[PDB]
């Protein structure tokens, strides 16, 4: 669209590489350190898709 097809969502990070023919539905704010950054944002605490 001229306003942008803002419907399909891509991923850019995961804890480990996934085996083929596998799908996930869950979206959780990431934690990538010793501090359990659950929260809403922080050090590598971003929205998945």
């Amino acid at each position: 669209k001229v306003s942008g097809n803002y419907n399909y969502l891509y991923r850019l990070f995961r804890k480990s590489n996934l085996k083929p023919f596998e799908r996930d539905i869950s979206t959780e704010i990431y934690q990538a350190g010793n501090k359990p950054c659950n929260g809403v944002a922080g050090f590598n605490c971003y929205f998945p898709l």
Binding site: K19, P20, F21, E22
Partner: protein, 49 residues
């Protein structure tokens, strides 16, 4: 009798449902030489169950 048809209290959007004929069941059963003996093995490879 079997009450609690919805053993799950809540269900989100369900990805797939399957219904078919049941397995080789036996009604009741004589004490000694029981007709029912379930021998199941469950395996997965790359999405195949």
């Amino acid at each position: 009798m079997e009450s609690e048809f919805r053993v799950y209290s809540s269900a989100n959007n369900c990805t797939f449902e399957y219904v078919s004929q049941p397995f080789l069941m036996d009604l009741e059963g004589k004490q000694g030489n029981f007709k029912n003996l379930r021998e199941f093995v469950f395996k997965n490879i790359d999405g195949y169950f």
